[PDB]
Enzyme design. Structure first.
Site, PDB file in Angstrom:
ATOM      1  N   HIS A 117       8.733  -6.930  -8.325  1.00 35.14           N
ATOM      2  CA  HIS A 117       9.279  -5.576  -8.207  1.00 35.14           C
ATOM      3  C   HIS A 117       8.654  -4.784  -7.057  1.00 35.14           C
ATOM      4  O   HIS A 117       9.372  -4.272  -6.179  1.00 35.14           O
ATOM      5  CB  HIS A 117       9.105  -4.811  -9.538  1.00 35.14           C
ATOM      6  N   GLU A 118       7.326  -4.664  -7.065  1.00 35.04           N
ATOM      7  CA  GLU A 118       6.625  -3.900  -6.032  1.00 35.04           C
ATOM      8  C   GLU A 118       6.894  -4.454  -4.637  1.00 35.04           C
ATOM      9  O   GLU A 118       6.913  -3.711  -3.660  1.00 35.04           O
ATOM     10  CB  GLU A 118       5.116  -3.874  -6.302  1.00 35.04           C
ATOM     11  N   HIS A 121       9.856  -2.988  -2.964  1.00 31.28           N
ATOM     12  CA  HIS A 121       9.530  -1.743  -2.244  1.00 31.28           C
ATOM     13  C   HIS A 121       8.913  -2.026  -0.872  1.00 31.28           C
ATOM     14  O   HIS A 121       9.239  -1.368   0.113  1.00 31.28           O
ATOM     15  CB  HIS A 121       8.518  -0.905  -3.036  1.00 31.28           C
ATOM     16  N   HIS A 127      14.295   2.096  -6.397  1.00 30.42           N
ATOM     17  CA  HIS A 127      14.577   1.686  -7.760  1.00 30.42           C
ATOM     18  C   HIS A 127      16.065   1.602  -8.006  1.00 30.42           C
ATOM     19  O   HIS A 127      16.849   2.252  -7.341  1.00 30.42           O
ATOM     20  CB  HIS A 127      13.977   2.666  -8.771  1.00 30.42           C
TER      21      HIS A 127
END
Ligand code: CA
Ligand code: CA
Ligand code: CA
Ligand code: ZN
Ligand code: ZN
Length: 162
Positions: A117-118, A121, A127
């Site tokens: 997930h990170e 970014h 998101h």
């Protein structure tokens, strides 16, 4: 006037894990991180080289509380991690809260699932509102961590297809 979203101009990025969490043996950590990058490079022309020292676009570290950036951690629970959008210096860096217990299984706070997930970014994604997407803000784990079509369409809109 229209503004674009932060992107990496090059398709080959370098990353470095600055330090390791005592929670897992170093082998598990390296594998969790390597496997997270692999999820993204699988659907784009992006390639990632792991450097053991020196310059790196994406700096990965396990920290706790105030760590000199402007988003200090909060101890166990709450925010587990955070990463910055592409750019110089802090741009692209991923920080993991050392106060969480990081695992390699179903036990809460599976490192690989959060890293995937990170890292979204670090490459420019924000998101998603889909509870089924990797880019959803809430921790969720079902044993397997794969990209949702939403994450796929999102990353491809920026870098193109493999
Ligand atoms: Ca926390
Ligand atoms: Ca950086
Ligand atoms: Ca820990
Ligand atoms: Zn941070
Ligand atoms: Zn996030």
């Amino acid at each position: 006037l229209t503004e674009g979203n932060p992107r990496w101009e090059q398709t080959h990025l370098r990353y470095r894990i600055e330090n390791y969490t005592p929670d897992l043996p170093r082998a598990d950590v390296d594998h969790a991180i390597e496997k997270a990058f692999q999820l993204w490079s699988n659907v784009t022309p992006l390639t990632f080289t792991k450097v053991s020292e020196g310059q790196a676009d994406i700096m990965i570290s396990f920290v706790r509380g105030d760590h000199r950036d402007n988003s200090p951690f909060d101890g166990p629970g709450g925010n587990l991690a955070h990463a910055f959008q592409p750019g110089p210096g802090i741009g692209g860096d991923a920080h993991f809260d050392e106060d969480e217990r990081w695992t390699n299984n179903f036990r809460e706070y599976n490192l690989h699932r959060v890293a995937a997930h990170e890292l979204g970014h670090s490459l420019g994604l924000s998101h998603s509102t889909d509870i089924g997407a990797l880019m959803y803000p809430s921790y969720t784990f079902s044993g397997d961590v794969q990209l949702a079509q939403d994450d796929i369409d999102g990353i491809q809109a920026i870098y193109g297809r493999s």
